[PDB]
Amino acid sequence: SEEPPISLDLTXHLAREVLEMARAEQLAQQAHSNRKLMEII
């Protein structure tokens, strides 16, 4: 019910998944896509 905030702490760790991976995949798509468009113009 009330517990140590276990899910949150673990989210602390796997933020390297859902924030670093997510943010990286965004930077990747928005690098290469943007750089393709930019490379065109």
- Cα separation, 5 vs 2, in Å, equals 8
- Cα separation, 23 vs 17, in Å, equals 9
- Cα separation, 35 vs 41, in Å, equals 10
In three-state form (DSSP H/G/I as H, E/B as E, the rest C), the secondary structure along the chain is CCCCCHHHHHHHHHHHHHCHHHHHHHHHHHHHHHHHHHHHC
What letters, b where the CB count within 10 A reaches 16 and e where it falls short, cover 21-34? eeeeeeeeeeeeee
Q: Measured between alpha carbons, how far is residue 40 from residues 7, 21, 27, 37 in Å?
A: 45, 28, 19, 5
The token duo for 35 is 């750089």
Solving technique: NMR
- Cα separation, 19 vs 13, in Å, equals 10
- Cα separation, 25 vs 11, in Å, equals 19
